[PDB]
Amino acid sequence: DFGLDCDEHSTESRCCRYPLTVDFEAFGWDWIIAPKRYKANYCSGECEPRGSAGPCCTPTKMSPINMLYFNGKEQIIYGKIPAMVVDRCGCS
Amino acid sequence: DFGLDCDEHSTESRCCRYPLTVDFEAFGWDWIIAPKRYKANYCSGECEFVNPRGSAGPCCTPTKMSPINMLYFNGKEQIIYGKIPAMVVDRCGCS
């Protein structure tokens, strides 16, 4: 099947996926040209190398984003950065 | 911190650190010279509260991990000696 999606107003106790904007500009990371901002989302809820065996509401599928940024050497980098967007949440 | 250690068959519900041996020789990775076997451990237990991780809910996860040095083949009479990061769980906690 699929993962569950929730808003800030859900009274959902199970492993669910919530919206979240990651703001690089707000972090102050100005070496990042684009994007200044993107939708990352996150996982939260209960479940009835990485060293965790216990079930946990974790991203079960993530997708990359393309970024444009400085290394400060008059060197601008355009790259595909993996695992930046939580597309789906589930337990282990 | 929240560093509890448990052995197997422990009666424990809280976030604890359990033993686990990773055994390259028994697994058959004969290209791995050393270590043949090492203590990796893992985290397990419940966590109460009243970017490429993207998890907010509390979870029993390693709060500290350490590397191991490995000696292995690429099969070209090429033996590689390197520091391999995050291979040993040293401590477990909720965050």
Author numbering:
A (entry chain B): 1 to 48, 66 to 109
B (entry chain A): 1 to 50, 65 to 109
Question: What does the paper behind this entry write?
Answer:
Growth/differentiation factors 8 and 11 (GDF8/myostatin and GDF11/BMP11, respectively) are two closely related members of the activin/inhibin subclass that share ~90% sequence identity in their mature, C-terminal signaling domains and ~52% identity in their N-terminal prodomains. Similar to other TGFβ ligands, GDF8 and GDF11 are disulfide-linked dimers that are initially synthesized as precursors, which are cleaved by furin-like proteases to separate the N-terminal prodomain from the C-terminal mature domain. The ligand dimer elicits signal transduction by symmetrically binding two type II and two type I transmembrane serine/threonine kinase receptors. Similar to other ligands in the activin/inhibin subclass, GDF8 and GDF11 predominantly signal through the type II receptors, activin receptor kinase IIA (ActRIIA; ACVR2A) and ActRIIB (ACVR2B) and the type I receptors, activin-like receptor kinase 4 (ALK4; ACVR1B) and ALK5 (TβRI).
We resolved the structure of apo-GDF8 to 2.25 Å and the apo-GDF11 structure to 1.90 Å using X-ray crystallography, thus allowing a direct comparison to the recently published apo-GDF11 structure (middle). Unexpectedly, resolution of the apo-GDF8 structure revealed a unique conformation such that the fingertips of each monomer are positioned proximally in a “closed” conformation compared to the classical distal positioning or “open” conformation observed for many ligands, including structures of FS-bound GDF8 (top). While the structure of apo-GDF8 adopted an unexpected “closed” conformation, a similar conformation has been observed for activin A when in complex with ActRIIB. In both cases, the wrist region is disordered and not resolved in the crystal structure. The extreme “closed” conformation of GDF8 is not entirely unprecedented, as one structure of activin A in complex with ActRIIB showed a similar “closed” configuration. Interestingly and despite the high sequence identity, nearly identical crystallization conditions resulted in two distinct conformations. Although these conformations may be a result of the crystallization process, it supports the idea that GDF8 and GDF11 are flexible enough to be trapped in alternate states. Taken together, crystallization of both GDF8 and GDF11 in their apo states reveals intrinsic structural flexibility in these ligands.
